[PDB]
């Protein structure tokens, strides 16, 4: 945040706090689980490895 009469940074607004992202879909922390398809149990264990 600047004072426009003198063109100087007087105070500083927080870093970030701006939505919308490039290269969508972008998802930090899904809450979609590995149980949503069952019976392929030994295949979850292998991708975990």
């Amino acid at each position: 945040a600047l004072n426009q009469q003198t063109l100087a940074i007087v105070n500083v607004l927080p870093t970030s706090k701006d939505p919308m992202v490039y290269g969508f879909e972008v998802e930090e922390k899904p809450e979609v689980s590995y149980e949503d398809i069952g019976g392929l149990d030994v295949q979850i264990e292998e991708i975990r490895e």
Partner: protein, 49 residues
Amino acid sequence: IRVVGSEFVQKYIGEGARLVREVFQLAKEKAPSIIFIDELDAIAARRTN
């Protein structure tokens, strides 16, 4: 981060690669990061000479 495999290749080309470059960057900035990259048969095809 989601790459759909349908946006891969045109009939003279360059954007297809560009979005690969893009997600590569988005991945580094946001470490650790997982790029799900479906669907790997429209960007890969047999070896020829």
